């Protein structure tokens, strides 16, 4: 629905772009921020 080019695809692409953009930055960082902060918290 992001690469879609049809009828009514504008709104769906606009709604999908933020989610695809965030699901590349939030998980990649979480993978390192969750264990770090959790180890800090356990001590």
């Amino acid at each position: 629905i992001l690469w879609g080019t049809g009828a009514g695809s504008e709104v769906m692409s606009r709604i999908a772009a933020p989610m695809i953009g965030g699901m590349i930055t939030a998980p990649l960082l979480s993978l390192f921020i969750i264990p770090a902060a959790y180890k800090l918290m356990w001590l």
């Binding site: 709104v11 692409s13 709604i15 933020p18 953009g21 930055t25 979480s30 969750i34 902060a37 959790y38």
Partner: protein
């Protein structure tokens, strides 16, 4: 762009819009164009002058393609002041002397004939040679009740003047609309540029106001709603997170992961060439939950 460049036709301010969106705009606001400025007040001359000034200042913004203000006093009238003294000297009431212009120079209907189910109206008027010019009206033959022959200049003074062509009123107050057309630059950018310009190089007049309408009002409403909508989402997420981990520490730990999601989303938005709208707001409100879900999975494992 090709359509706009091919049909210039001096004498028209071109405007191209989809049908459904254009009609929804005209229904919700009344302004056909995406951007519009309403000049309100009580005096027609002040409103017209202010609209002219604003229209003349708006077409200097680099992003604007055209700007046109609706004129209130753009109507030509032929005033026939019927002198009552003269009209009485010949023994004829006002109605008897204005019937010579409501039916002869006019042609108002008199009835309708039926044919099965259909119905068609009837007309009555003088020939065309008696409505050529005001000088042809001043020579209109008048058959007085005294069975006399006189002209229309002996009982009335006819002149040409200007006045309102149509009176648009919103909430029982006269208003003048200004249609702006800008297709190359952003919407909020040109709106802010016009606000600054008409607040800098144009002075207001007591009794008249200026209000931006069209898509901007709905944009501002949705923006305020989305701005006040984030706390509810964050609170629901935190509550449902404490419901699962039974600790505030882990809840805050994994709820502090949505900022990275927002950063990534705005970066991708900038990279793809999209603009910030209500669709992107909904996208962010939805992405918050997915980020929280991923954090929950990671921390649970």
């Amino acid at each position: 762009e090709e359509l706009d460049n091919t049909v210039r036709l001096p004498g028209l301010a071109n405007l191209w819009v989809p049908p459904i969106r254009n009609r929804i705009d005209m229904l919700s606001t009344g302004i056909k164009s995406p951007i519009g400025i309403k000049v309100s007040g009580t005096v027609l001359a002040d409103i017209d002058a202010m609209a002219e000034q604003i229209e003349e200042v708006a077409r200097t913004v680099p992003g604007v393609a055209s700007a046109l203000a609706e004129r209130l006093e753009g109507g030509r009238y032929i005033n026939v002041e019927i002198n009552r003294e003269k009209a009485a000297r010949y023994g004829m009431t006002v109605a008897d002397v204005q019937l010579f212009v409501t039916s002869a120079v006019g042609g108002a209907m008199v009835g309708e004939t039926v044919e099965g189910i259909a119905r068609y109206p009837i007309n009555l008027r003088y020939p065309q040679s008696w409505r050529d010019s005001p000088q042809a009206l001043r020579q209109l033959p008048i058959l007085t009740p005294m069975k006399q022959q006189i002209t229309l200049a002996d009982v009335a003074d006819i002149k040409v003047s200007t006045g309102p062509s149509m009176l648009k009123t919103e909430n029982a107050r006269p208003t003048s609309w200004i249609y702006i057309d800008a297709r190359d630059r952003d919407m909020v950018s040109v709106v802010h540029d016009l606000q600054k310009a008409i607040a800098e190089k144009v002075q207001l007049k007591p009794g008249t106001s200026v209000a931006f309408s069209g898509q901007f009002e709905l944009l501002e409403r949705a923006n305020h709603k989305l701005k006040l909508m984030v706390p509810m989402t964050l609170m629901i997420i935190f509550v449902l997170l404490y419901l699962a981990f039974r600790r505030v520490g882990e809840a805050l730990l994994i709820i502090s992961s949505v900022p990275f999601a927002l950063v990534g989303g705005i970066w991708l938005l900038w990279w793809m060439g999209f603009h910030l709208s209500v669709a992107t707001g909904t996208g962010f409100i939805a992405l918050a939950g997915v980020a929280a879900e991923f954090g929950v999975v990671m921390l649970m494992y």
